[PDB]
Amino acid sequence: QWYSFLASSLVTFGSGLVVIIIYRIVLWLDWAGELISGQTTTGRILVGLVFLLSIASLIIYFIDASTNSSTTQQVDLAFNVFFMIYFFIRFVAANDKLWFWVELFSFVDYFTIPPSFVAIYLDRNWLGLRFLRALRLMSIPDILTYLNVL
Questions:
Q1: Which of 97, 83, 88 is nearest to 32 (CA)?
Q2: Where does it reside (predicted)?
């Protein structure tokens, strides 16, 4: 439990760091850019959808915690799939990789998506680090900026 699920997140983070190091060593020794933007309709819609789905994932995490495979596990899997798709979109949209890989939302995704996949594969009810999804609430000020209420 302690190392059965966190190992997936640690392995994914280490593999990403190794890939970035290899890319930098090789160097030394786009549409996604439009997708992640400001007032653009696609960017605003994507950010809002990600934020509301993060709220939904947090809520189902509250439900799981208060009730301490399940259908809610499959819904969380769909949310994780959408979030990891957005992860690759913003990754290829990023100008650099080493600086991008250390961002807060990167760790947020690392500590929840691989553990969720492993738990669903093993059909276990591990609580996981889904509460880090609440960090996505920090995207609220931009969304309101897009909504002009601010």
A1: 88
A2: Cell membrane
Q: Which residues contact 57 (CB under 8 A, 6 or more apart)?
A: 76, 79, 80, 130, 133
Dihedral of CA 87/27/99/9: which sign?
A: positive
Per-residue tokens: 124: 């276990």
Can you tell me whether residue 94 is helix, strand or coil? coil
Resolution in A: 2.9
User: Do the Cβ atoms of 74 and 51 come closer than 8 Å?
Assistant: no
Q: Structure solved using which method? A: cryo-EM
In 10 A of CB 30, how many CB atoms? 8
How far is 55 from 14, CA to CA, in rounded Å? 28
Element (H, E) at 107: helix 104-110
Nearest 5°: CA angle at 51, between 43 and 12?
A: 95
SS3 135: helix
